Design a protein around this ligand. Structure first.
Ligand SMILES: Nc1ncnc2c1ncn2[C@@H]1O[C@H](COP(=O)(O)OP(=O)(O)OP(=O)(O)O)[C@@H](O)[C@H]1O
Ligand SMILES: Nc1ncnc2c1ncn2[C@@H]1O[C@H](COP(=O)(O)OP(=O)(O)O)[C@@H](O)[C@H]1O
Ligand SMILES: Nc1ncnc2c1ncn2[C@@H]1O[C@H](COP(=O)(O)OP(=O)(O)O)[C@@H](O)[C@H]1O
Ligand SMILES: Nc1ncnc2c1ncn2[C@@H]1O[C@H](COP(=O)(O)OP(=O)(O)O)[C@@H](O)[C@H]1O
Ligand SMILES: [Mg+2]
Ligand SMILES: [Mg+2]
Lengths: 198, 1558, 160
């Protein structure tokens, strides 16, 4: 438990706070509001769980059944089913899961900061850091349709390397002025991906 | 009971008559003397019974052979069960019964139409009402043989369908060859010919046309033009109004024609020049030869290398599948599998259209199909029976959800599937395979289909040998756009393509934009329901226009249908998201609602009648009324329902009031059956199958459905609503996935198929869907009852209405006093007021259990009902001076604040009780006592309307010396009196309640002090374990209550009339939580609390409790062994939290006991207060350090202090002259025996000894420390009759003499005596001394535990009992052992010691019976039948032998239980294990509550040294010249210095043993 | 042995060894799962002859009084209470429990009552067996004369 509490105070240093930012016609705004609310709820739950487990590891607090299970699985090193709300690849370890959650929290903090001040369209986003990327893409499509008064059925995608999506990574290919080229490299990073609805 | 059996089987009839007469004589001779010995004394009774059994077996085998011969005579009679077929045999002359079994023998032939004299059948009739006239009628007169005339019916039906198909093809040739088609001729043709015939005729005409065109570019264009012309004619014909049968025929035919148009377009897009191209060979092909004289094989259905013959079986109308290209690919691979003689096996996620696609393929080929919902209850004999039924008929099996089939059984049935596949492969080239050790004919039309979902609910996978026999096919994404377009064009819509292209991506965005929910479904099933609702509302709007062709608002119609289907499914947050999606998809959207004035007014009337708050849409009840209307719409348009929401959202009242309003409107009575699925086992819910004989009993739901189907009491006319008031999990809800689907039937393992009539709607009342699967979410309609739908002010208004009407003791003074109370608490309940603010603050606070609104609200309502009862009692007490208005006001206005305090904060700690009191004092202007320090919770409202403190109520009592630690005596304190008043308040109303708190907090003591105040209630104590089943409650009811038949049903009443029987459950939350978040006992108790009773599983009859109430005790759910309860149960049951008394209460609680017991010594009485003050902080420090985290048995409670005081009192009762040092020695010895035997390591034992020394020194200065405290500190009564201290050496000599005597009588096994064995034997003797003393010894085997127990029991005159465990030791033999032990204990009145080991336990029933025996002292449900009467006779004989004369049964049983408590001592031996200790803590609370724990452990180093030095002292081991080494390896402490040779070698032996450990 | 021994022989050599050792005294070979096991045990206790029981994995607790060596002294007569029958325990009664699986754990109640004899395979024994097999399959005359010479040397040491 001494080393467990050492690691327990080690992990949550990158998790401090998140705002919740509530009735607008903008699909992007309402989607970002509900996503940052979900992220804030998850962050508060994780912080409360960490505070409770620190208190029971070193402090005046007895261990309940839930806290006993939590401390057992944290010593074991596997992610709890309670924290796993979004998609995690094949049970990633907690060491990288906390970094992934921290990255998501910082991204949502930047989203809330930008929305606190449209200016929401000018931001740049990374698609892997959101909870529901298909909801993000459909919200972008809905925003484009609402702006241009077009038909959702025949709305295609033109992709250039007017929405900025970052963090996309290729698999055995290279991009030069939007021309794919085969390569022996395992993966390549796309700098910035432009999405236009035509 | 049939006279035809006598005629058909005369020899068997005579044999049965002889057997019956012989058995009549035998049973008359038996009944003339019912004694077992007298029956055995009959001459030749065994031989007569053997001969009768042989004769019965012979006649049974003969009748079975004859019945199987009849089955072989008619192949379709293999479906009919034995009793129904016997009824058919006995009803051959009369044919009024035979019309009720055609559903199981034919796909759609519901009934057949006969002549008026029934001498000839003329044709068949469909389920819908369509008819097919036979070409030549079948007369049963010239063919009286049932098989002969039924085969004539079959072949006549075949040739009739063939002739009709040929005529239809000759007719449709004209329409195919005509450029323009006259609608009148087309419609009269369609009316002339059946649905399947006209569809197949269109197929044949299209295939012949395309073949001729390809034989002759331009001809293909001509064929496509002809198809488009026919399609335009169809659209023109279907746009107008038509009879429903013709409308369905046109819909099916237009779907088929649009599929044919798509196929021809695909063919003409490429360049096809020959008929051998695969692009043409891969589609459906039909061929008709007029030259074939065999009309059965006239039609050939062909695909790519797959030639087939049409089934020619009537199917009715059914539903036509939309020919998706995915469906075409599925058809291709299924027909390839069928040609390869391998059964097909589509698989994929639920809702992709697997079983419906297989059904449509089977209907396309004309084959009879049978959809089976296989589950874990399928047995091998049942599966073989349905396999042989398929094989001897030709019906296609369509086993749905094949993966949940008990994988060992899956492997077992793989062999049968292999035999069937091999038989078919041989058939493809008198063809017979063997099934269930019997050769059975195989029809050529066989097919087995498997519909399985991978990874649905963790179901079992498939073995590879079985996977090899099935051709897999994955279907994941059906063409939603194409199916929507085709079905909308079929139903008739001008902009069908636009509507589909707008509604399918609408669902695509709807499945992704909204929040994730466990009960959200947007699959193909939801899309199809939306489209069908759109068609229905379009027809309704067309009728609404036409009552007064043109155009209709198709977009508005579709939006209205999608709203009426989807908006009840949503949560309150997602409705604006859905509305925005509809706005952007359809700009000119609009909406329409209302137009429900009649139902709305009837709902208002019944809401007013039933004391409910009505809303019109924007008032207080608007959301709830809107939800009721949504439920009505979903009931009308859908099949299966569920009301999803948190506990207490008005779903039950919603569906009840809707049922009553619907009954008021339509005039049809609404019968509703409420079933809890988890309160009983799934076996009891659905039905049982005997492995011995293949006989099927009905479960609860199956019996209800069978009764509805039979409709002997006109059940079909009335509206039937079956509700499953429980929680859903895929173990039992997957048995209804065929019921809730469009198949509309229930399948059973024995093969009996129960269709579902349209009158029945199957609904659910669930809390969450987080444990059910998508396969069962996707089938029902969701109505989401949110938490804020039901409002606290509506609850208050209902409570006030129920107070003003419906008096408590059911004009009357109760009515007037209730009305006065309602009028004076009216300003408090309404709007915000007081109670809502207090409730919001209570929700802000935390509690021991989860706090819901309705728990504390029901608490409040019961407390106020008790206040009204108190006012009524005072009014009766003062007839000259009734209750004045201002006094009633100033009394109820304070009872209200007291009641909300003890309701909202009744399950919290003292600090938060004070916090809520301070909050209420700050927030309300109500007269309150003036005390800045005393909380409001420390006050009692008086009948005079003033606050009376409890501190004035509690008296300073001094209990007598005779009872100091008796089980019933309680000294009154603040907490005890407050909880006493609260418990009396609860129990006056016969309401459930749960005492939650830490173990040993006095909760059952408080409850029993409450029950002893009211003489009208008697307690039946129950104890729960981990493996607790509602059978325990059932047997408690069986023993303590009786079942009585009444005109309004059956009722359960206590045997003692005029009394209320209360059930006390000490471990209510301890029953285990299963894999799906439920407890069967908890759900059972909740069901009987809500609905007033349960379902008697003997005959599935609803039973009603007459005078039964429940009281509960439990540990907090945070404890290691306990689990939290469900909200749906915690709603009705208030929870009161009792904590440990603490020092400031325990001081006087045990000061009164010590001052009561320090009376026999008139000189010691000045030490009572320092003695109690000394015993306080020892208990406090033991609580401080030895927490439950270290060990599961480290629980310290005031039960230990009570045992302490009782031990001191038993020690010094005869001693009568004790100095201070002797008293301190007794105190220290009791402290050691209570706080050191449970410890494990020696360090904590040393800590306890140091604590005892420092406590005695601190609290008792200037005393003889050496005299009071010593090393051995032993106490015994063997040497002298008084309980005096003994010396170790004198005790050892006496014990050695006792062993030397003891080896002679019982066991000649020598023993070695040392200090630890002396301590153990004294401990066991002391625990055996007190009555109801039960042991628990933990230690490694071989430490002498059972031998020492045997020695103690021999010394104290206790008969040692060993259970004599052997092989195949089962439950009945264990119960025989227990009943013999209990008989010898309670009837013979002898001292008995029960010795049994952990290894002697083989089943959890053993541990459960030991649990209840240890705790209650009796085992209910153990003595039944004449064995019970023998026990009662033994008990009355024992009473007569003792001297006391008793009577009746219950007091004799109570005396027997008291004798068992006094006599039976039970000893347990365990082994130390980390898992085992907490496992037994979870599975047996009595083993760690009613049993004192002794931790022998392994032998210590000192014990090993002493036994070695004692044993090796008999031989020469001294070396006169021995050199002590300077290293001196020391493993045993306190070695003598300098050690000798024998000391060194004994130390070496100890070292050897320790090094073996490491 | 003092406690009745349990032998763990996965090779089958120890069973034949104990049969050849106690050949003059009759041994009834039986197993725990056999139906006539209790009757065999009763016959062994009455007759006072050695008994060997195999397959102790399915151990039944009916042998607990015998393994614990509990005894009732009826004067000079030796009495044991086995189940529900009182049997005169002859002093010349010995029981052996066999095993074919070394990878079996036992409960401590069975572990305390018996003496464990583990018949494993070691380097010297394996090398000697393989060398003797190689000599048998390669140099038959040398192998047989070596066997004769060792037997002669052993009985000559007996003569010494
Ligand atoms: N429209 C209403 N107006 C007033 N009171 C109501 C209304 N609907 C429900 N109630 C109250 O709700 C209380 C709780 O019972 P109800 O049957 O409504 O619960 P429920 O939502 O079915 O609960 P559960 O989910 O736990 O089964 C009832 O005592 C009733 O008085
Ligand atoms: N291609 C289709 N054409 C018409 N109806 C379909 C189609 N696919 C699915 N359905 C509908 O979906 C349901 C089929 O259920 P299905 O998905 O086969 O059950 P399971 O999920 O067990 O495979 C039926 O109500 C059927 O009407
Ligand atoms: N106020 C009190 N006055 C006297 N005895 C008390 C008091 N509180 C607790 N006790 C003692 O504590 C014990 C409580 O045990 P019990 O109520 O049986 O525990 P549980 O309720 O967990 O079964 C009783 O034996 C009782 O003598
Ligand atoms: N103090 C002792 N002196 C001598 N032998 C002992 C002693 N304690 C136990 N034994 C031996 O242990 C055997 C049984 O041990 P015991 O612990 O009583 O049974 P179990 O191990 O099944 O609980 C007896 O045969 C006895 O010879
Ligand atoms: Mg299915
Ligand atoms: Mg309800």
């Amino acid at each position: 438990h001494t080393t467990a509490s050492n690691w327990l105070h080690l992990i949550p240093q990158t998790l401090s706070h998140l705002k919740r930012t509530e009735n607008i016609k903008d699909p992007l705004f309402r989607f970002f509001e509900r996503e940052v609310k979900m992220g804030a709820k998850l962050l508060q739950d994780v912080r409360q769980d960490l505070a409770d487990v620190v208190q029971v590891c070193e402090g005046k607090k007895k261990q309940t059944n839930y806290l006993r299970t939590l401390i057992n699985e944290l010593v074991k090193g596997i992610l709890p089913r309670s924290w796993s709300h979004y998609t995690v690849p094949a049970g990633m370890t907690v060491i990288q899961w906390v970094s992934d959650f921290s990255e998501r929290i910082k991204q949502l903090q930047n989203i809330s900061l930008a929305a606190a001040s449209k200016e929401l369209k000018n931001i740049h986003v990374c698609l892997g850091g959101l909870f529901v990327p298909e909801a993000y893409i459909t919200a972008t499509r809905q925003y484009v349709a609402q702006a241009n008064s077009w038909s959702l059925e025949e709305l295609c995608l033109e992709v250039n390397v007017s929405f900025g999506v970052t963090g996309l990574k290729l698999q055995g290919a290279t991009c030069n002025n939007n021309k794919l080229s085969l390569s022996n490299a395992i993966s390549t990073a796309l700098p910035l991906t432009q999405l236009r609805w035509v | 009971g049939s006279a035809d059996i006598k005629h058909l089987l005369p020899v068997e009839t005579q044999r049965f008559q002889s057997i019956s007469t012989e058995f009549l004589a035998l049973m008359k001779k038996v009944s003339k003397s019912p004694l077992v010995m007298d029956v055995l004394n009959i001459q030749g009774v065994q031989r007569s019974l053997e001969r009768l059994a042989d004769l019965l077996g012979k006649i049974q085998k003969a009748l079975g052979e004859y019945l199987e011969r009849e089955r072989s005579s008619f192949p379709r009679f293999y479906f009919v069960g034995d009793e129904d077929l016997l009824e058919i045999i006995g009803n051959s002359k009369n044919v009024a019964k035979l019309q009720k079994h055609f559903k199981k023998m034919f796909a759609g032939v519901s009934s057949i139409i006969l002549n008026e004299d029934n001498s000839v059948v003329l044709g068949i009739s469909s389920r819908e009402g369509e008819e097919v006239m036979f070409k030549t009628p079948v007369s049963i007169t010239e063919h009286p043989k049932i098989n002969e005339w039924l085969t004539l019916v079959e072949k006549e039906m075949r040739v009739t369908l063939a002739k009709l198909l040929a005529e239809s093809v000759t007719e449709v040739e004209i329409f195919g060859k005509a450029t323009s088609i006259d609608p009148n001729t087309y419609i009269t043709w369609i009316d002339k010919y059946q649905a399947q015939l006209v569809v197949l005729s269109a197929q044949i005409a299209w295939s012949e046309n395309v073949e001729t065109a390809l034989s002759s570019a331009a001809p293909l264009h001509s064929v496509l033009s002809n198809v488009e012309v026919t399609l335009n004619v169809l659209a023109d014909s279907v746009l107008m109004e038509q009879p429903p049968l013709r409308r369905r025929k046109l819909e099916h035919l237009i779907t088929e024609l649009v599929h044919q148009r798509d196929v021809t377009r695909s063919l003409i897009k490429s360049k096809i020049d020959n008929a051998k191209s695969f692009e043409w060979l891969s589609q459906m092909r039909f061929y008709f030869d007029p030259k074939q004289t065999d009309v059965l094989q006239q039609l050939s259905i062909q695909m790519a290398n797959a030639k087939f013959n049409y089934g020619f079986e009537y199917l009715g109308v059914q539903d036509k599948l939309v020919q998706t290209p995915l469906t075409d690919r599925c058809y291709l691979t299924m027909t390839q599998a069928l040609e390869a003689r391998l059964g097909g096996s589509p698989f994929g996620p639920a809702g992709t259209g697997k079983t419906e696609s297989v059904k449509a393929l089977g209907h396309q080929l004309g084959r009879f199909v049978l959809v089976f919902n296989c589950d874990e209850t399928f047995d091998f004999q049942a599966m073989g029976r349905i396999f042989v039924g398929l094989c001897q008929v030709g019906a296609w099996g369509c086993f749905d959800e094949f993966n949940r089939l008990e994988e060992r059984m899956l492997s077992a049935v793989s062999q049968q599937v292999q035999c069937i596949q091999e038989a078919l492969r041989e058939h493809s080239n008198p063809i017979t395979c063997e099934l269930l050790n019997k050769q059975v004919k195989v029809s050529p039309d066989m097919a087995i289909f498997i519909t399985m979902n991978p990874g649905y609910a963790g179901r079992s996978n498939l073995p590879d040998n079985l996977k090899k026999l099935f051709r897999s096919l994955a279907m994941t994404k059906p063409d939603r756009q194409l199916i929507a377009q085709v079905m909308l064009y079929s139903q008739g819509f001008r902009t069908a393509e636009v509507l589909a292209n707008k509604i399918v991506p609408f669902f695509k965005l709807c499945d992704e934009q909204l929040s994730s929910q466990s009960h959200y479904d947007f699959g193909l099933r939801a899309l199809k329901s939306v489209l069908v609702s759109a068609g229905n509302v379009k027809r309704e709007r067309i009728q609404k226009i036409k009552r007064e062709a043109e155009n209709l608002p198709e977009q508005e119609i579709l939006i209205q249908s999608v709203c009426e289907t989807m908006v009840p499914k949503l949560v309150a947050e997602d409705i604006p998201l859905l509305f925005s999606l509809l706005s952007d998809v359809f700009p000119g959207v609009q909406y329409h609602r209302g137009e429900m004035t009649a139902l709305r007014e009837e709902l208002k009337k019944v809401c007013q009648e039933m004391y409910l708050t009505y809303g019109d849409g924007e008032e207080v009840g608007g959301m709830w009324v809107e939800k009721v209307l949504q439920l009505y719409q979903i009931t009308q348009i859908n099949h299966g329902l569920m009301m999803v929401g948190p506990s207490g959202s008005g779903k039950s009242m919603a569906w009840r009031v809707l049922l009553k309003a619907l009954e008021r409107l339509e005039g049809v009575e609404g019968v509703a059956h409420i079933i809890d699925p988890k309160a009983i086992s799934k076996d009891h819910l659905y039905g049982t199958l005997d492995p011995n004989t293949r006989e099927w009993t009905d479960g609860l739901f199956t019996h209800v459905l069978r009764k509805i189907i039979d409709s002997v009491r006109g059940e079909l006319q009335k509206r039937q609503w079956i509700v499953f008031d429980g929680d859903v999990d895929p173990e039992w809800v997957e048995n209804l996935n065929s019921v809730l689907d469009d198949n509309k039937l229930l399948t059973l393992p024995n093969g009996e198929r129960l269709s579902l009539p349209p009158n029945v709607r199957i609904m659910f009342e669930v809390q969450d869907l987080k444990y059910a699967t998508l396969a069962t979410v996707s089938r029902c309609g969701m109505v989401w009852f949110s938490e804020d739908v039901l409002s606290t002010d509506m609850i208050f208004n209902n409570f006030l209405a129920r107070l003003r009407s419906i008096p408590l003791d059911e004009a009357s003074p109760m009515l007037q006093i209730q009305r006065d109370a309602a009028t004076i608490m009216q300003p408090y309940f309404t709007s915000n007021g007081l109670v809502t603010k207090a409730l919001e603050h209570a929700f802000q606070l935390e509690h021991i259990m989860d706090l819901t609104r309705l728990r504390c609200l029901g608490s409040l309502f019961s407390m106020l009902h008790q206040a009204c009862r108190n006012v009524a009692q005072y009014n009766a007490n003062h007839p000259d001076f009734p209750m004045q208005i201002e006094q009633l006001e100033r009394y109820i206005q304070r009872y209200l604040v007291y009641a909300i305090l003890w309701s909202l904060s009744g399950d919290s700690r003292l600090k938060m009780r004070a916090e809520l009191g301070e909050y209420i004092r700050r927030i309300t202007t109500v007269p309150l006592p003036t005390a800045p320090n005393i909380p409001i919770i420390d006050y009692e409202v008086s009948i005079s309307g003033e606050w009376s403190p409890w501190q004035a109520k509690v008296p300073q009592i001094e209990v007598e010396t005779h009872k100091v630690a008796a089980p019933d005596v309680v000294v009154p304190t603040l907490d005890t009196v407050r909880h006493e008043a609260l418990l009396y308040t609860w129990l006056a109303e016969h309401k459930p309640l749960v005492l939650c708190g830490p173990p040993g907090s006095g909760k059952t003591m408080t409850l029993f002090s409450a029950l002893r105040a009211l003489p009208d209630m008697e307690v039946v104590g129950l104890n729960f374990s981990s493996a607790t089943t509602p059978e325990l409650l059932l047997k408690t009811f069986d023993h303590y209550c009786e079942y009585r038949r009444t005109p309004n049903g059956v009722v359960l009443a206590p045997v003692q009339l005029g009394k209320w029987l209360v059930l006390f459950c000490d471990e209510i939350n301890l029953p285990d939580m299963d894999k799906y978040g439920t407890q069967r006992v908890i759900s059972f108790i909740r069901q009987m609390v809500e609905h007033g009773g349960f379902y008697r599983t003997s005959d599935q009859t609803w039973v009603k409790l007459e005078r039964i109430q429940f009281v509960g005790a439990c540990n907090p759910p945070t404890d290691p062994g306990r689990k939290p309860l469900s909200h749906r149960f915690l709603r009705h049951v208030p929870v009161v939290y009792v904590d440990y008394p603490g020092p400031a209460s325990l001081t006087q609680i045990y000061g009164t006991f010590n001052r009561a017991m320090l009376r026999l010594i008139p000189s010691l009485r000045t030490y009572a207060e320092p003695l109690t003050a000394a015993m306080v902080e020892f208990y406090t420090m033991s609580q401080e350090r030895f927490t439950q985290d270290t060990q599961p048995h480290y629980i310290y409670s005031p039960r230990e202090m009570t045992r302490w005081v009782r031990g001191i009192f038993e020690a010094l009762r005869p001693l009568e002259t004790l100095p201070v040092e002797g008293l301190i020695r007794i105190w220290a010895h009791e402290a050691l025996r209570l706080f050191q035997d449970r410890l494990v390591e020696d360090e904590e034992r040393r800590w306890t000894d140091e604590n005892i020394d420092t406590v005695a020194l601190k609290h008792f200065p200037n005393i003889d420390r050496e005299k009071a405290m010593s090393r051995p500190i032993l106490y015994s009564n063997w040497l002298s009759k008084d309980y005096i201290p003994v010396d170790q050496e004198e005790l050892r000599d006496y014990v050695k003499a006792r062993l030397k005597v003891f080896y002679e009588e019982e066991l000649d096994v020598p023993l070695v005596l040392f200090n630890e064995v002396l301590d153990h034997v004294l401990r066991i003797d002391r625990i055996f001394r007190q009555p109801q003393g039960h042991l628990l010894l933990i230690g490694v085997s071989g430490a002498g535990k059972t031998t020492l127990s045997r020695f103690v029991a021999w010394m104290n005159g206790l008969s040692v009992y060993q259970i004599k465990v052997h092989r195949k030791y089962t439950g009945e033999d264990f119960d025989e052992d227990l009943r013999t032990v209990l008989r010898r204990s309670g009837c013979k009145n002898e001292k008995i010691a029960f010795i049994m080991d952990e290894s002697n336990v083989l089943d959890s029933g053993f541990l459960e019976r030991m649990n209840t025996l240890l705790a209650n002292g009796e085992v209910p449900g153990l003595f039944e039948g004449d064995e019970y009467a023998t026990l009662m006779t033994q008990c009355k004989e024992g009473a007569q032998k003792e001297g006391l004369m008793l009577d009746s049964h219950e007091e004799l049983y109570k005396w027997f239980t008291s004798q068992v408590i006094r006599n039976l001592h039970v000893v347990f031996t365990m082994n130390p294990s980390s898992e085992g200790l907490k496992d037994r803590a979870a599975t047996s609370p009595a083993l760690f509550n009613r049993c004192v724990l002794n931790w022998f452990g392994d032998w210590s180093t000192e014990a090993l040294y002493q036994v070695g030095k004692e044993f090796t002292s008999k031989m020469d081991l001294e070396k006169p010249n021995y050199i002590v080494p300077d290293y001196m390896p020391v493993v045993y402490d306190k070695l003598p210095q300098p050690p000798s040779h024998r000391e060194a070698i004994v130390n070496s032996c100890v070292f050897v043993h320790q090094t073996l450990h490491q | 042995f003092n406690r009745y021994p349990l032998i763990i022989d996965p090779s089958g050599q120890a069973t034949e060894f104990i049969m050849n050792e106690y050949k003059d005294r009759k041994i009834t070979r039986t197993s725990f799962l056999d139906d006539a096991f209790r009757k065999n045990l009763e016959s062994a206790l009455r007759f006072g002859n050695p008994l060997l029981v195999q397959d102790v994995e399915s151990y039944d607790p009916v042998l607990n009084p015998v393994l614990n060596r509990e005894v009732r002294r009826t004067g000079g007569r030796v009495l044991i209470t086995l189940g529900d029958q009182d049997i005169d325990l002859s002093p010349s009664f010995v029981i052996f429990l066999s095993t074919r699986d070394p990878t079996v754990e036992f409960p401590p109640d069975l572990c305390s009552r018996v003496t464990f004899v583990n018949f494993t395979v070691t380097r010297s024994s394996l090398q000697s067996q393989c060398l003797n097999e190689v000599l048998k399959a390669e140099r038959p005359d040398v192998d047989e004369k070596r066997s004769d010479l060792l037997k002669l040397q052993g009985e000559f040491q007996l003569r010494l």
